[PDB]
Design a protein around this ligand. Structure first.
Ligand code: HEM
Ligand code: HEM
Ligand SMILES: Cc1cc(N)nc(COc2cc(CCN3CCC3)cc(F)c2F)c1
Ligand SMILES: Cc1cc(N)nc(COc2cc(CCN3CCC3)cc(F)c2F)c1
Ligand SMILES: C[C@H](O)[C@H](O)[C@H]1CNc2nc(N)[nH]c(=O)c2N1
Ligand SMILES: C[C@H](O)[C@H](O)[C@H]1CNc2nc(N)[nH]c(=O)c2N1
Ligand SMILES: [Zn+2]
Lengths: 418, 414
């Protein structure tokens, strides 16, 4: 048993679910790595083609978990499924997931995402099976439908599209973009940077691949899609499918003159979904923004848009010294604007108050119906107004459950070109 | 073996070798992280205390480039003599200053450690009575306050012997405000201290029952019953809170004390336990303006400030809470700065901690840090420590938590 306490309410939860974790956190009883971005490399199999005594134990575990999930442990379906996975592994060195299994696993990878504040919705995910895909064109078709379905004219809906799992390791399916919709980043001759500095490298690869950049500040980047190991290919997302929100302020009417807008759909496309030892290297998933993600990190990180400068200038704030708190004051107004713009354009968005409050309820639900809920306090607490949100005062146990979403190398570091 | 932390804003990479020198547990396991548990994981026998003393003396004589020296070996032999004869030992005045400064340096949760080497150590191990402690603590306060030009200081009382003669400051801080619950359920003063306020009142304290009553010192010497003493009001430096733009802010009637002085911790050096060691420095703005005034369990003046700010308080997404919080923290910094009372804003504080950290990696081989505590409780990502990876491990000497004395003390009078 392991108890967590909330210090605003004295609610104590008891955690047993953590007993079912397998992967090292990176911590030891002598050092805590809770603030390391990538604390561990304990993966469940060797990098590529696994042997039978390697793959099957994980497969047996997942199927066991899935059938245990639906009250059918040891049933005919369960015991045949096992024999079915054995022969597949024997005869193909891999195995294929049933549709139900794939959906269970996608959902429980989100459910186990200890960094995600949005998980109260984990059961409501739409899974798009794209395992039949064979080309970057087909990849591009699956993604456009994902984008269109998920955007739903602003009434955003969470979805994941799952492309063929990794086989030998070279025949990887990869979305080279980090998100499906990101703005481009242009290294300027005068040292500075136009657009999104996070994407300078990726923007240059696109240019290097033949992308003709319109060299603005909010240039939607092409899709760079790689299928069964081949060279990636540029596809331009139909603009009518990329919903965008112009940022304006409900009070400062000069705020719209800053010319800012952000895209409506956050869709993480460079991560790896892992289920029963299988590895889906292309699984773009999407939901809706927490407003701080755009207004705190995307606009106000130093290595990002860094618009605190401008916003505070137009607000007439003493930017001489830090003690005036001019960054804080502009930061709030930016995030107020971002929220008011998305809500005015009927585009789904949630503020950090609602979301954190939502996540407290999710934890409660999880400790009652599951015996625990893995949460990463460093990532749940929003990057502004930490202590006025309920999660700041909530103790959290962090631990690694499978299925999960894993990081993976940026493909251009590892891809032998053709 | 080495370990690397990265700053994701600057891409600076530091190599922690110091984490090897730790041997106290964090509470994390290999398969579970407890990094956000507030408190994770009678006294030392002879055999327990020998190596702890040995490790500390060894580390002391290393620090001063005297390891293996004649004085190093004689000191070791001297410490063993005492632990045999008396089942404990006594630190030298150098050792006490060195251990107290290093327990601060080793405090992973403190963002203010760039100052650790300028700690003023007051040795109070001759104290025998609560009156003696009042005297010592008053002198601490007068020295640390320095007419608003604050100075860092710890006052260290006799260590623990058998656990039945502990010195303890029952106050959590040396200056705090009282909290009184009302019949109607509301709270006058500081709701954090309601319990300790009741303990005082019960002990005979005649309370003013105002919003900012400085609490009495509840002092325990040699395991006797604690005793009440009123800090002389002229040694309590206070700052009336006003706002540089909102003339109406002074009408909130708010004030805070200028001297942060934590008194309920235990100082541990070489296996010795100093159960009473109040220490003080100066405030970071957010500790008063974010947590003291705006936690729902505390003064909860977001409510009022937003109202007078004419904010839309219906929907959260108006961020009225965020917007008012910023203004309360502007008011706090401007008030202190105006009254020339020392205060550091959270940007300057986090900046200095990154500098400190990198310096500690250069010369010491690492610097344990509790990201969950280092990040200020507001505007997290726009400070450099948010993007700073940090390794957390437990070095000794350290400051440690201990039970509240009214949970464990057994009484004497009547
Ligand atoms: C529906 C609304 C959602 C919201 C508001 C939300 C919010 C967040 C936030 C704020 C983070 C912190 C990362 C950052 O700040 O950049 C995060 C992380 C994450 N989210 Fe969610 N999320 C949502 C949906 C989803 C969905 C649909 C999935 C997958 C199916 C998902 C998977 C993840 C993962 C895997 C991580 C972090 C993984 C890691 O870094 O180890 N989220 N989320
Ligand atoms: C000189 C200026 C100082 C500043 C600005 C400062 C600031 C802080 C802050 C903001 C915290 C976080 C705690 C909270 O917010 O509740 C903290 C924790 C702490 N500080 Fe410092 N501090 C200072 C001096 C000192 C001194 C002089 C000592 C001891 C001699 C010390 C030891 C500690 C300890 C032990 C903790 C908490 C560790 C724990 O609770 O486990 N600090 N400090
Ligand atoms: C689906 C979804 C909805 C939503 N609203 N937000 C998110 C955030 O997704 C993620 C963001 C990051 C960024 C990490 N930072 C950049 C360098 C550090 C990493 C991940 F692994 C994520 F999964 C996802
Ligand atoms: C000397 C000094 C200067 C300064 N500016 N701030 C501090 C705050 O340090 C501390 C803060 C807390 C908060 C604990 N809360 C009760 C549950 C959470 C506990 C401690 F033990 C500290 F030491 C100390
Ligand atoms: C639950 C969580 O561990 C707790 O609220 C912590 C978080 N970080 C903190 N950080 C500081 N500086 N002070 C605190 O009291 C806390 N409390
Ligand atoms: C060093 C630190 O772990 C790193 O910057 C983390 C901190 N917390 C975060 N929290 C969220 N939500 N997103 C992030 O990218 C990060 N970055
Ligand atoms: Zn840990």
């Amino acid at each position: 048993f392991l108890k967590v306490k909330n210090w605003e309410t004295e609610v104590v939860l008891t955690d047993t679910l953590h007993l079912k974790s397998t992967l090292e956190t990176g911590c030891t009883e002598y050092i805590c790595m809770g603030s390391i971005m990538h604390p561990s490399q304990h993966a469940r199999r060797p990098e590529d083609v696994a042997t039978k005594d390697q793959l099957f134990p994980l497969a047996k575990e997942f199927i066991d978990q899935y059938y245990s999930s639906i009250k059918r442990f040891g049933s005919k379906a369960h015991m045949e499924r096992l024999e079915e996975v054995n022969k597949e592994i024997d005869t193909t060195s891999t195995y294929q997931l049933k549709d139900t299994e794939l959906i269970y696993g996608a959902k429980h990878a989100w459910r186990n995402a200890s960094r995600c504040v949005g998980r109260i919705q984990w059961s409501k995910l739409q899974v798009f099976d794209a395992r039949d895909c064979t080309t970057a064109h087909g990849m591009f078709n699956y993604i456009c439908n994902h984008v269109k379905y998920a955007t739903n004219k602003g009434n955003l809906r969470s979805a994941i599209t799952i492309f063929p799992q990794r086989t030998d390791g070279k025949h990887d399916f990869r979305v080279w973009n980090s998100q499906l919709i990101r703005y481009a980043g242009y290294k300027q001759p005068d040292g500075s940077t136009l657009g999104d500095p996070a994407n300078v490298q990726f923007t240059e690869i696109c240019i290097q691949q033949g992308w003709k950049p319109p060299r603005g500040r909010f240039d939607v980047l092409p899709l760079l899609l790689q299928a069964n190991g081949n060279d990636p290919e540029l596809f331009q997302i139909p603009p009518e499918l990329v919903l965008e929100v112009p940022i304006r302020h409900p009070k400062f009417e000069w705020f719209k003159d800053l010319g800012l807008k952000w895209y409506g759909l956050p869709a993480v496309s460079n991560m790896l979904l892992e289920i029963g030892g299988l590895e889906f290297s292309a699984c773009p998933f999407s939901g809706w923004y927490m407003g701080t993600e755009i207004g705190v990190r995307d606009y106000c990180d130093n290595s990002r848009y860094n618009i605190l400068e401008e916003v505070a200038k137009k607000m007439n704030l003493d930017m001489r010294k830090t003690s005036s708190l001019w960054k804080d004051q502009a930061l709030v107004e930016i995030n107020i604007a971002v929220l008011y713009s998305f809500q005015s354009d009927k585009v789904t968005i949630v503020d950090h108050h609602s979301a954190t409050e939502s996540f407290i309820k999710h934890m409660e639900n999880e400790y009652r119906c599951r015996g625990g809920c893995p949460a990463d306090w460093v990532w749940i607490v929003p990057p502004m107004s930490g202590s006025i949100t309920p999660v700041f005062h909530q103790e959290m146990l962090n631990y690694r459950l499978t299925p999960s979403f894993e990081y993976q190398p940026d493909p251009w570091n590892t891809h032998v070109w053709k």
